[PDB]
UniProtKB/Swiss-Prot annotation, chain A:
Keywords from the UniProt entry: ATP synthesis, ATP-binding, Cell inner membrane, Cell membrane, CF(1), Hydrogen ion transport, Ion transport, Membrane, Nucleotide-binding, Translocase, Transport
Function: Produces ATP from ADP in the presence of a proton gradient across the membrane. The catalytic sites are hosted primarily by the beta subunits.
Keyword Nucleotide-binding: yes
Source species: Acinetobacter baumannii (strain ATCC 17978 / DSM 105126 / CIP 53.77 / LMG 1025 / NCDC KC755 / 5377)
Name of the protein in its database record: ATP synthase subunit beta
From Swiss-Prot, chain B:
Subunit structure: F-type ATPases have 2 components, CF(1) - the catalytic core - and CF(0) - the membrane proton channel. CF(1) has five subunits: alpha(3), beta(3), gamma(1), delta(1), epsilon(1). CF(0) has three main subunits: a, b and c.
Subcellular location: Cell inner membrane
Highest taxon, organism lineage: Bacteria
Function statement: Produces ATP from ADP in the presence of a proton gradient across the membrane.
Protein name: ATP synthase epsilon chain
Residues of the full protein shown: 71 to 139 of 139
Family, per entry: Belongs to the ATPase epsilon chain family.
């Protein structure tokens, strides 16, 4: 992103991340062995801080731009779970897929009453 | 009338214990009106309120089946 050329402008960058939820899951797997106390449903007490530390770097500044697409996993089909609920506030466009539409043979199974954009 | 069969057809007929029958037919009119009014009341009360009340609130529970709190 922050790369320039002599008499040459910058370049646009596309970034693709697959299942950013596994990052928080791996953080969960080692929290107890580090000596912390659990919170919520067995989650680490530093979920939001360590999500935000990574999320604030994926951005576009005055010098260069980044377009990113991420896939977010929803455990046990529960949108109320702390990880997706914390993740919801870091995005500009959110697409929500539902199993009820998928089981009816409709593809892509995008829920039109829960998808928003700025 | 004829020697083998006798039949008289009447649009409105009833046993004429008196020269008038309105005071007897009014009881049947009252019975019919009362039955109609009670039947309408029973149908309305049994269906319109009850089915709507049952169907009032069901989704706030279905939407939270997979919640773990």
């Amino acid at each position: 992103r922050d790369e320039k050329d002599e008499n040459g402008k910058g370049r646009d960058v596309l970034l693709f991340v697959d299942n950013i939820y596994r990052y928080t899951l791996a953080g969960t797997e080692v929290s107890a062995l580090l000596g912390r106390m659990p919170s919520a449903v067995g989650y680490q007490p530093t979920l939001a801080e360590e999500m935000g530390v990574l999320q604030e770097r994926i951005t576009s500044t005055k010098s260069g731009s980044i377009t990113s697409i991420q896939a977010v996993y929803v455990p046990a089909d529960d949108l109320t779970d702390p990880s997706p609920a914390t993740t919801f506030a870091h995005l500009d466009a959110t697409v929500v897929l539902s199993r009820d539409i998928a089981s009816s043979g409709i593809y892509p199974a995008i829920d039109p009453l829960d998808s928003t954009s700025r | 009338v004829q020697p083998h069969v006798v039949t008289v057809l009447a649009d409105t007929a009833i046993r004429a214990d008196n020269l008038d029958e309105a005071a007897i037919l009014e009881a049947r009119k009252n019975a019919e009106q009362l039955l109609a009014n009670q039947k309408s009341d029973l149908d309305s009360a049994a269906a319109l309120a009850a089915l709507a009340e049952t169907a009032a609130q069901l989704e706030t529970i279905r939407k939270i089946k997979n919640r773990a709190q």
